[PDB]
Amino acid sequence: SHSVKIYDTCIGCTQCVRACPLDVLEMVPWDGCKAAQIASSPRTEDCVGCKRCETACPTDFLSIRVYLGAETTRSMGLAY
Amino acid sequence: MALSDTQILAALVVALLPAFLAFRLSTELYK
Amino acid sequence: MTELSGQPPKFGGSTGGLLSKANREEKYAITWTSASEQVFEMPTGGAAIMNEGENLLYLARKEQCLALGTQLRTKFKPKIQDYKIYRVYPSGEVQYLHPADGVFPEKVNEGREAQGTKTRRIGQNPEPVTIKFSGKAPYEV
Amino acid sequence: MATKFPKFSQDLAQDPTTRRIWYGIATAHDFETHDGMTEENLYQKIFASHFGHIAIIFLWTSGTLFHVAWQGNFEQWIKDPLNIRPIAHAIWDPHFGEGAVNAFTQAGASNPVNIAYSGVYHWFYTIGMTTNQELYSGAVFLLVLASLFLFAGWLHLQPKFRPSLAWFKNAESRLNHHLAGLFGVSSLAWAGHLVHVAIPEARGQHVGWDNFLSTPPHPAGLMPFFTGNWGVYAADPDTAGHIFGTSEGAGTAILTFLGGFHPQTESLWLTDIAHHHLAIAVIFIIAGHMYRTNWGIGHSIKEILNAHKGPLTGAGHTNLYDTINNSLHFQLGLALASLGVITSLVAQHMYSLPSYAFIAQDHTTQAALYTHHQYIAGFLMVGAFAHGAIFFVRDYDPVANKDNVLARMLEHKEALISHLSWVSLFLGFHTLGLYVHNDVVVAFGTPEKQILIEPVFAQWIQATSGKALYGFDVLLSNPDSIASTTGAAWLPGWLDAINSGTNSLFLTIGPGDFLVHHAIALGLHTTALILIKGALDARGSKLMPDKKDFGYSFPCDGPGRGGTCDISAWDAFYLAMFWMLNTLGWLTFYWHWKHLGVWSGNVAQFNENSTYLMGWFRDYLWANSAQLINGYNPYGVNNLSVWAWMFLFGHLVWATGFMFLISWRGYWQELIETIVWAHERTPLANLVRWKDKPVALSIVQARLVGLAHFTVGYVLTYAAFLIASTAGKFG
Amino acid sequence: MDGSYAASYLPWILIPMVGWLFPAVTMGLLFIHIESEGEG
Amino acid sequence: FVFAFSLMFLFSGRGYWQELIESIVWAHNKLNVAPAIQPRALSIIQGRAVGVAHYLLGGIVTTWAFFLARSLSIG
Amino acid sequence: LGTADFMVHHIHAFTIHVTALILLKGVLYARSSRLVPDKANLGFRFPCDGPGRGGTCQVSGWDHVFLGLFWMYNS
Amino acid sequence: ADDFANLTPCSENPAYLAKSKNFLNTTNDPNSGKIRAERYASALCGPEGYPHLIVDGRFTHAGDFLIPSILFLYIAGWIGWVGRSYLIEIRESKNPEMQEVVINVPLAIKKMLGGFLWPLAAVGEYTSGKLVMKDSEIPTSPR
Amino acid sequence: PYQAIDYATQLSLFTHHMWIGGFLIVGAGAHGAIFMVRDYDPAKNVNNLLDRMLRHRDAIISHLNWVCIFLGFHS
Numbered sequence A: 001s002h003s004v005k006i007y008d009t010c011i012g013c014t015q016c017v018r019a020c021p022l023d024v025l026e027m028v029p030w031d032g033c034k035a036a037q038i039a040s041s042p043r044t045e046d047c048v049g050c051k052r053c054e055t056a057c058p059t060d061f062l063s064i065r066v067y068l069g070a071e072t073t074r075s076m077g078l079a080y
Numbered sequence B: 001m002a003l004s005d006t007q008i009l010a011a012l013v014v015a016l017l018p019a020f021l022a023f024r025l026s027t028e029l030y031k
Numbered sequence C: 001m002t003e004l005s006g007q008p009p010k011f012g013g014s015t016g017g018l019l020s021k022a023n024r025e026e027k028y029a030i031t032w033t034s035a036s037e038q039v040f041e042m043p044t045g046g047a048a049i050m051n052e053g054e055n056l057l058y059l060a061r062k063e064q065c066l067a068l069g070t071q072l073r074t075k076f077k078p079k080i081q082d083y084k085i086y087r088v089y090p091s092g093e094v095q096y097l098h099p100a101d102g103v104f105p106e107k108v109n110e111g112r113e114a115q116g117t118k119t120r121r122i123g124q125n126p127e128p129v130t131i132k133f134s135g136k137a138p139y140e141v
Numbered sequence D: 001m002a003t004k005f006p007k008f009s010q011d012l013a014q015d016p017t018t019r020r021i022w023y024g025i026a027t028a029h030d031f032e033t034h035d036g037m038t039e040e041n042l043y044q045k046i047f048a049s050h051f052g053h054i055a056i057i058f059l060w061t062s063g064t065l066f067h068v069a070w071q072g073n074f075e076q077w078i079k080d081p082l083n084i085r086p087i088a089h090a091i092w093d094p095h096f097g098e099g100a101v102n103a104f105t106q107a108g109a110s111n112p113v114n115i116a117y118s119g120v121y122h123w124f125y126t127i128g129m130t131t132n133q134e135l136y137s138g139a140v141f142l143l144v145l146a147s148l149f150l151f152a153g154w155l156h157l158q159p160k161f162r163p164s165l166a167w168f169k170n171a172e173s174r175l176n177h178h179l180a181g182l183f184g185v186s187s188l189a190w191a192g193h194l195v196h197v198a199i200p201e202a203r204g205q206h207v208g209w210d211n212f213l214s215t216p217p218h219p220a221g222l223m224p225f226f227t228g229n230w231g232v233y234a235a236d237p238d239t240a241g242h243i244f245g246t247s248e249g250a251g252t253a254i255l256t257f258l259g260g261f262h263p264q265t266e267s268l269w270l271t272d273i274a275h276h277h278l279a280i281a282v283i284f285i286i287a288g289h290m291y292r293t294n295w296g297i298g299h300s301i302k303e304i305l306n307a308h309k310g311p312l313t314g315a316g317h318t319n320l321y322d323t324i325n326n327s328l329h330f331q332l333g334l335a336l337a338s339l340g341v342i343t344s345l346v347a348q349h350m351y352s353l354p355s356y357a358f359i360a361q362d363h364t365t366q367a368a369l370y371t372h373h374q375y376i377a378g379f380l381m382v383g384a385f386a387h388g389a390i391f392f393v394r395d396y397d398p399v400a401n402k403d404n405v406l407a408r409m410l411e412h413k414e415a416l417i418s419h420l421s422w423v424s425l426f427l428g429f430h431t432l433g434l435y436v437h438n439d440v441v442v443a444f445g446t447p448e449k450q451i452l453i454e455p456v457f458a459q460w461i462q463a464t465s466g467k468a469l470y471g472f473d474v475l476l477s478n479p480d481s482i483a484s485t486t487g488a489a490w491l492p493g494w495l496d497a498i499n500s501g502t503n504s505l506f507l508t509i510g511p512g513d514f515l516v517h518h519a520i521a522l523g524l525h526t527t528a529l530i531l532i533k534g535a536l537d538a539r540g541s542k543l544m545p546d547k548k549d550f551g552y553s554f555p556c557d558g559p560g561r562g563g564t565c566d567i568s569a570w571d572a573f574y575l576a577m578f579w580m581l582n583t584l585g586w587l588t589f590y591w592h593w594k595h596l597g598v599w600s601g602n603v604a605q606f607n608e609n610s611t612y613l614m615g616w617f618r619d620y621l622w623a624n625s626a627q628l629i630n631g632y633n634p635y636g637v638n639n640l641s642v643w644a645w646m647f648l649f650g651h652l653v654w655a656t657g658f659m660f661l662i663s664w665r666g667y668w669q670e671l672i673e674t675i676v677w678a679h680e681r682t683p684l685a686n687l688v689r690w691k692d693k694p695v696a697l698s699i700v701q702a703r704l705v706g707l708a709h710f711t712v713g714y715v716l717t718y719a720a721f722l723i724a725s726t727a728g729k730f731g
Numbered sequence E: 001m002d003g004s005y006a007a008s009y010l011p012w013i014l015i016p017m018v019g020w021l022f023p024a025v026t027m028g029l030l031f032i033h034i035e036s037e038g039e040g
Numbered sequence F: 001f002v003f004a005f006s007l008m009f010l011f012s013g014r015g016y017w018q019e020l021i022e023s024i025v026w027a028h029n030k031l032n033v034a035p036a037i038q039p040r041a042l043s044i045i046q047g048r049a050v051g052v053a054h055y056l057l058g059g060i061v062t063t064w065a066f067f068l069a070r071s072l073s074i075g
Numbered sequence G: 001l002g003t004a005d006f007m008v009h010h011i012h013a014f015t016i017h018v019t020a021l022i023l024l025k026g027v028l029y030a031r032s033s034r035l036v037p038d039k040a041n042l043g044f045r046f047p048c049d050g051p052g053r054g055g056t057c058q059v060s061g062w063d064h065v066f067l068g069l070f071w072m073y074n075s
Numbered sequence H: 001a002d003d004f005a006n007l008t009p010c011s012e013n014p015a016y017l018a019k020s021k022n023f024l025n026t027t028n029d030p031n032s033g034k035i036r037a038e039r040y041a042s043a044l045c046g047p048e049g050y051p052h053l054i055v056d057g058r059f060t061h062a063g064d065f066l067i068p069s070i071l072f073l074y075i076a077g078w079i080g081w082v083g084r085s086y087l088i089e090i091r092e093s094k095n096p097e098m099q100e101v102v103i104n105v106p107l108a109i110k111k112m113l114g115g116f117l118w119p120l121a122a123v124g125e126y127t128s129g130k131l132v133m134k135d136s137e138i139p140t141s142p143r
Numbered sequence I: 001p002y003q004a005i006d007y008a009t010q011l012s013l014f015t016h017h018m019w020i021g022g023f024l025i026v027g028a029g030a031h032g033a034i035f036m037v038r039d040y041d042p043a044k045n046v047n048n049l050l051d052r053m054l055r056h057r058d059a060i061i062s063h064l065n066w067v068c069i070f071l072g073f074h075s
């Protein structure tokens, strides 16, 4: 399964989760930013690695990072 | 003079030694 | 997870739906309620009709279910936001999946534990040479 | 679906798709990323693999010797090496018909046969071998040597005999042994063989295992070497009328320095060759006494590196000893770069200064050797830069190399890459401009309006070595010069060999040579630009500041931040491979067209038509295909049939690679989804199910496989053309 | 196809063994090996 | 030439070129000559469009010159 | 018309069929596929949907047109 | 002395003379070929009869490269300098991208007309510190 | 009058019209795809020809795929 990490430059704009087509990420309470929220990746077993989240990120170089890893039926996006 | 029938056959027999040694080396490197 | 209920959408069939993986490995279910009998686009191709009331539909992947869910909540004049997505195993086990804690993941909800969080910047990952011959990568340490 | 293979990566072995197999093949030799790999186990597995590889080399050489001795015509080809075609091995193919059987029953053989272009007959003959018995004995001995190395590799995997990491990192001792023993003692042994077998056997004196202990290579024994005067070993060198393999005009000398070419064999003098090997043996032995080991005297490389600082270079070479000795990729890059340099050197020297008897007259083998070695050198250079990039990705420590030369190179990488880009643009614009100007000016019927730049620099250089054609009269070309008035024993022979337009020694050059040299400069600079920019940005750029976290090779970083295809340093290697092939194409086209003109006595064709690109297109490529493409015909078949078939085969493989290069993955994965559906729903075929899920090739895999096809087609197409054209004209 | 070289009966059977038997056998062994669902 | 030129665009990807452009933009900033309209590598779609346009142009022009020379030189 | 004409007519049928395959697949899967069930939201012209799912480059209808151009040129 | 022996003056070269009696007319002037023959009979020809240019730097062949080199360099420095100057001048105009896309014809012509003094202008900008920038003030990527 | 004897005109006109036709056909593929992405309304295509085409796209394309493989092998 791919790895998804969220670093402390997160502004909590929620576009991470809004872009995910597989519900890997969540908005969880935090205190580092004004929005009092941060992105989390509790369900990376369903991640396919399309990179939509990072495409949505505004911070100067991403606060969310997807590193493709061990390929499974789910991560390869297989319907068969 | 040309090469002999026996020299060709003796070549394969001798080559049996590096074949066995290559088998051993390959199987050891698999570990 | 008790027993999934809901009528299947009115649909004439297609070649784009479930394959062997559904029975050998895993399949996915999405339920939702509709205030009216109305047309929607199948993620597997073509048009189908959702029933007034509860609806239950089986798809091959989680992504197809979430695509149908976005279509339901963003492409109907009164939105459809009550959809639920489950994972289904051949043993019969049903695993509720989405929305995970009854609240859509885009908005904060109390009780969620941060996963995959790092207390540093991306630029503050360690040099790979410092972690070589280990099993980790700079983002895993 | 638990799946063992590959046992070194659980990530791959858990992949349920066909990818698992492909990647299993593609990552087996990347020991560093195997599950549980340590540094010591790494060095040890690499040691055993080295032993196995050396054994493979010895077995390949055994096969060459054995097939020449079995199915060849070595002894016949000795009788008349200028009119008999040397034989590689026998053909056995049940697909053949009568036409091909007759066409390949050649070179005087009674069965189908292939003509050897490896130059191996000339080598074995100049060595001193004259019978199939000696070749067979050498082949069997190499069988035994390969066995020895296979056993050594196996033995050094056993617990007691596994060398330690400190032993692998003992750089000073290994350098002493490789300079003194591997280089020096071996060169001394080859000087001894030449003096004992090659030189006598060239004079009708059979010297073998059964008499070499009793027949001195010189009438005066070793005492002249032990007492004082060595001029006796220069004795009476072989006269200008020496007939190779006979006593006619033969002498007794063993070490000479008369330079030039043996008049009959048109190659370097054997005595000069043995003397060279002896001298460089002494020098390498002395070199192997520089670094300390176990006796206090000697040098510490760490000290020498830490002692070469600089007022304008910061920390100099400090800590480069550990930087190099801890990175197998740094050392491998050094090795591949130096090896590619010396392989190109081999190529540029063996065609100009051949050392094997009657090989300068074998045009097909000479062309094939030059092309072969230059291609090998290009591959080596690309690999050296690839592994420099891999070093930066995996091994570079910025705090240990802080402010030293490595980090400082990294610190102005923008300037390096930018100026490489500038000189690339410079060369490209202006060389293409001159070529296209010449094309248009000749096309419109005014060939006198071309821009024909005389290559005065290289001509002046040739003049510095005696070449009096251009009339510069500088240094060696000037008899009044002090470089000529030295009394050197090599000057007369060197001048006679360089002032005769009958060899390849400093071939005459004109404007075509100028233009193609600037094309070569463009190709070298562009390939270096791709490789260096990949290496320096391997750790990061503004598009990917964290690229080092992702590894040397990876598909991309997605359509975000503008799009990031071919963003990795592996991708830079892949892109530079095309420019490597292009540069080699220009280089080898150059060599072959010029040597065709030279061998045929018509240098004017190249001199007059190389200045415009239609000249290459028509007089070189188009013309020299006529026999090649006629290897098989509606009217019959000849001995060039195999090369015509291989020519078309190389075209087909090249074009097939284009598919993997232009069409990308998603299109294929969706098509394969339709095919998967079809299989699951076809009765009878239903009975069968796949064990691995069929999926399209991966992004990186597509680049690799497309490049592999492209390169295979490139090499086979050009080899077919080169071989067939040169053997149809002169073979 | 004939052979004046010594032991020219060797290619007669060696060509089918190197072209048919060795490839088929080795591909079969490798197919079985890379599909073995042991442990990992 | 146009056919060969198209292969650069078809066989590569924009990330490499964006980094090369980064180095060249550094060169420009060094002499205070960088443009306000920042240079970007072509988009992925545009790389493909340029590649295929040049592939078709070069190949078709080649066949056109060939056909016209032939059919005009054959009575 | 003889053997060579037979063979080249079947070459024509083959290349036309491949061009049709590419463009018809482009149209029929422009909305969705098993790989990418929301392709319609991505548009007609777009480069891919990332290196995930094994890699999704050239799934768009535009990219099918891009490939069909080469195959039409071949035909 | 006997330098460039591989070549001969085109007036000496007989192949050049034979081919120059047949030099085609490049324009409408029926003497263009004859003028070309007379003009090129001054260079150094090769055995094939075409002129060869000597660019090693000797002033006897200064017209083969040195003079066109000087001319090109003057013109190219002119173009680059006036372009860079206009590019600098746009930056103080709030929206410089628009004037990069929609050219300020009067300003650009003012800049172009003042380019004949670009060597002295570049020397002055070098001494004044306007031409080159400092490293620590230029954006760079991670190392 | 006199076009057939002018083999250059004959070849040129044939090939020119060929290329124009091929480009127009590929464009037809392009705009079928654009229709699918931008104008197709599933509520206006319930169990009609277009809908059923979408609903067995897999059969259509797998068979066209196989026909192309067969035609390539046997040409």
Ligand code: CLA
Pocket: D046, D047, D050, D051, D054, D167, D168, D170, D171, D173, D174, D175, D177, D178, D180, D181, D182, D183, D186
């Ligand atoms: C005198 C002692 C000695 C000698 C004989 C060697 C010999 C060798 N060692 Mg070793 N080594 C030694 C001591 C020694 N070692 C010690 C003390 C250490 C510990 C410090 C090491 C540790 C060590 C390691 C870790 C490794 C080696 C390896 C090797 C092999 C290098 C590969 C090779 O075969 O290329 C042979 C090269 C030459 C014969 C000369 C180089 C080529 C010249 C420069 C150019 C070409 C020559 C000529 C122009 C071309 C001829 C063309 C021909 C066709 C006509 C080699 C045979 C490597 C290996 O392969 O392991 C098996 C390896 O991994 N050594």
Ligand code: CLA
Pocket: D025, D026, D027, D028, D029, D030, D031, D332, D379, D380, D382, D383, D384, D386, D390, D552, D553, D570, D573, D708, D712
């Ligand atoms: C002695 C020299 C040497 C050494 C030991 C290494 C060692 C290594 N290299 Mg390196 N490299 C070298 C030379 C070398 N390389 C050269 C010359 C090049 C330029 C081509 C490269 C470019 C390079 C790159 C870009 C990469 C490596 C990688 C690696 C590592 C993984 C190897 C692997 O598993 O690949 C697997 C091996 C293969 C897939 C072999 C397939 C190619 C075959 C031999 C060609 C097939 C020909 C075909 C059958 C034609 C038949 C003809 C017929 C039909 C007529 C490994 C540590 C990889 C790595 O791990 O990065 C860290 C990596 O990505 N190398």
Ligand code: CLA
Pocket: D420, D421, D422, D424, D425, D426, D427, D428, D429, D432, D522, D526, D529, D530, D575, D576, D578, D579, F001, F004, F005, F006, F007, F008, F009, F011, F012, F020
């Ligand atoms: C004939 C084929 C071809 C051509 C012309 C080029 C061109 C170029 N490549 Mg490329 N390349 C090719 C094939 C080709 N490539 C292939 C197959 C690959 C493998 C994918 C690559 C991969 C590659 C890489 C990775 C890199 C290059 C680089 C370069 C540039 C090198 C510098 C130079 O030569 O300056 C001069 C330029 C030229 C000679 C080409 C332009 C010629 C035209 C006619 C100039 C005139 C302008 C023209 C009038 C414009 C008006 C058009 C109008 C009619 C519409 C150059 C622009 C390197 C680079 O960017 O250097 C900085 C670089 O990094 N190439």
Ligand code: CLA
Pocket: B011, B012, B013, B015, D056, D059, D060, D061, D062, D063, D064, D066, D089, D090, D091, D092, D139, E010, E011, E012, E014, E015, E018
């Ligand atoms: C790498 C060396 C090499 C190569 C390339 C060849 C090549 C060839 N051989 Mg030969 N052979 C060799 C060594 C070699 N030989 C040696 C040393 C011997 C003496 C034992 C023989 C004895 C032999 C016989 C009796 C015959 C051939 C024949 C042939 C031809 C068909 C192959 C075959 O059917 O025979 C199979 C070959 C063997 C049974 C001998 C084993 C080969 C060596 C000892 C092992 C090589 C292993 C290799 C290095 C591993 C590389 C793996 C790598 C890809 C990773 C072929 C052109 C046939 C022929 O005459 O053609 C018409 C034939 O009948 N060979």
Ligand code: CLA
Pocket: F053, F057, G045, G062, G065, I023, I024, I025, I026, I027, I028, I030, I034
């Ligand atoms: C009556 C026919 C027709 C009509 C009117 C349209 C209409 C349209 N098409 Mg379509 N199409 C057609 C035929 C047609 N097309 C053909 C024949 C093809 C096959 C090539 C396509 C393939 C196609 C694609 C792939 C796309 C369109 C797109 C579009 C839309 C944008 C137009 C555009 O790109 O703007 C501006 C036009 C240009 C920038 C063209 C410049 C580049 C050309 C190709 C250079 C040509 C070179 C020249 C002919 C020869 C060399 C000269 C040179 C040396 C100087 C537009 C509504 C786009 C879209 O998004 O649709 C919504 C798009 O993605 N079409």
Ligand code: CLA
Pocket: D652, D655, D656, D657, D658, D659, D660, D662, D663, G018, G021, G022, G067, G070, G071, I064, I065, I066, I068, I069, I070, I071, I072, I073
């Ligand atoms: C000459 C180069 C080449 C070749 C060989 C192919 C091959 C193929 N392409 Mg392709 N393509 C190419 C260039 C090439 N392409 C390029 C440059 C592009 C970029 C635009 C594309 C893009 C492209 C697309 C988008 C598609 C194809 C499709 C196809 C397949 C068509 C079906 C078919 O022909 O079945 C039969 C196969 C052949 C005729 C290949 C030759 C087989 C030989 C004659 C027999 C084999 C002998 C035997 C097996 C040898 C075994 C040796 C032993 C040691 C194992 C086919 C396998 C289409 C497809 O997949 O259709 C289903 C498809 O959609 N191509």
Ligand SMILES: CCCCCCCCCCCCCCCC(=O)OC[C@H](CO[C@@H]1O[C@H](CS(=O)(=O)O)[C@@H](O)[C@H](O)[C@H]1O)OC(=O)CCCCCCCCCCCCCCC
Pocket: D155, D158, D159, D160, D161
């Ligand atoms: C041109 C001629 C060149 C010189 C002549 C060399 C030829 C003679 C080679 C003799 C080989 C005999 C094979 C049969 C014995 C065998 O396999 O033992 C294998 C065992 C390994 O046991 C292993 O022991 C392992 C455990 S442990 O490591 O012992 O703890 C255990 O796991 C494993 O099962 C067990 O096998 O090896 C030994 O323990 C000793 C090996 C003896 C080899 C002598 C070689 C002579 C040196 C000459 C060359 C030196 C050059 C070095 C510098 C360049």
Ligand SMILES: CCCCCCCCCCCCCCCC(=O)OC[C@H](COP(=O)(O)OC[C@@H](O)CO)OC(=O)CCCCCCCCCCCCCCC
Pocket: D308, D309, D310, D311, D312, D313, D315, D316, D317, D405
């Ligand atoms: C035609 C071929 C030449 C083109 C190559 C590419 C263009 C070169 C332009 C690069 C300018 C480099 C600026 C240096 C920046 C600089 O000044 O660094 C500072 C340095 C002063 O520090 P030191 O000399 O004390 O450092 C030397 C070490 O002891 C300390 O690390 O000056 C030099 O090194 C002068 C040598 C420059 C080396 C030039 C590179 C080319 C060398 C070619 C090979 C020489 C012969 C080798 C024989 C073994």
Ligand SMILES: CC1=C(/C=C/C(C)=C\C=C\C(C)=C/C=C/C=C(C)/C=C/C=C(C)/C=C/C2=C(C)C(=O)CCC2(C)C)C(C)(C)CCC1
Pocket: D061, D065, D134, D135, D137, D138, D139, D141, D142, D189
């Ligand atoms: C006791 C001793 C001495 C006496 C030594 C005597 C009495 C003999 C010494 C022989 C020696 C020391 C070396 C002989 C080496 C021969 C070698 C090493 C052969 C190497 C061949 C190789 C490596 C491969 C060759 C190949 C083959 C097989 C081919 O057939 C084709 C070419 C090629 C592929 C190259 C003296 C008193 C002097 C000094 C004191 C010690």
Ligand SMILES: CC1=C(/C=C/C(C)=C/C=C/C(C)=C/C=C/C=C(C)/C=C/C=C(C)/C=C/C2=C(C)CCCC2(C)C)C(C)(C)CCC1
Pocket: D329, D330, D331, D333, D334, D337, D341, D381, D384, D385, D387, D388, D389, D391, D392, D532, D535
């Ligand atoms: C990336 C990288 C890298 C790199 C790599 C490479 C690939 C390199 C190279 C390079 C090269 C490839 C170089 C070349 C060179 C050369 C030289 C250095 C030369 C010398 C010279 C001289 C000086 C000579 C002289 C002479 C003459 C001319 C003649 C007569 C004699 C005499 C001697 C006088 C490394 C890994 C390291 C690190 C990391 C990164």
Ligand SMILES: CC1=C(C/C=C(\C)CCC[C@H](C)CCC[C@H](C)CCCC(C)C)C(=O)c2ccccc2C1=O
Pocket: F008, F009, F010, F012, F013, F014, F017, F040, F041, F042, F043, F044, F046, F047, F048
């Ligand atoms: C070279 C290259 C580039 C770099 C190419 C660039 C940046 C384009 C440079 C174009 C210049 C600026 C314009 C020159 C061409 C003009 C359109 C012609 C106009 C001529 C008139 C003035 C007469 C990419 O961006 C790229 C992206 C994706 C895949 C492959 C590639 C690729 O191969």
Ligand code: SF4
Pocket: A009, A010, A011, A012, A013, A014, A015, A016, A017, A038, A039, A053, A056, A057, A058, A059, A062, A063, A064
């Ligand atoms: S991942 Fe980035 S873009 Fe997405 S919500 Fe977090 S900070 Fe915002």
Ligand code: SF4
Pocket: A004, A019, A020, A021, A022, A023, A024, A025, A046, A047, A048, A049, A050, A051, A052, A053, A054, A066, G052
């Ligand atoms: S890579 Fe794709 S699937 Fe994974 S978290 Fe990001 S948007 Fe979701």
Ligand code: SF4
Pocket: D555, D556, D557, D558, D559, D563, D564, D565, D566, D664, D699, F013, F044, G047, G048, G049, G050, G051, G052, G055, G056, G057, G058
């Ligand atoms: S390589 Fe493919 S997946 Fe990756 S960015 Fe490019 S088009 Fe997209």
Ligand SMILES: [Ca+2]
Pocket: D128, D129, D130, D201, D206, D207, D208
């Ligand atoms: Ca002898």
Ligand SMILES: [Mg+2]
Pocket: D349, D350, D353, D354, D355, D356
């Ligand atoms: Mg030599």
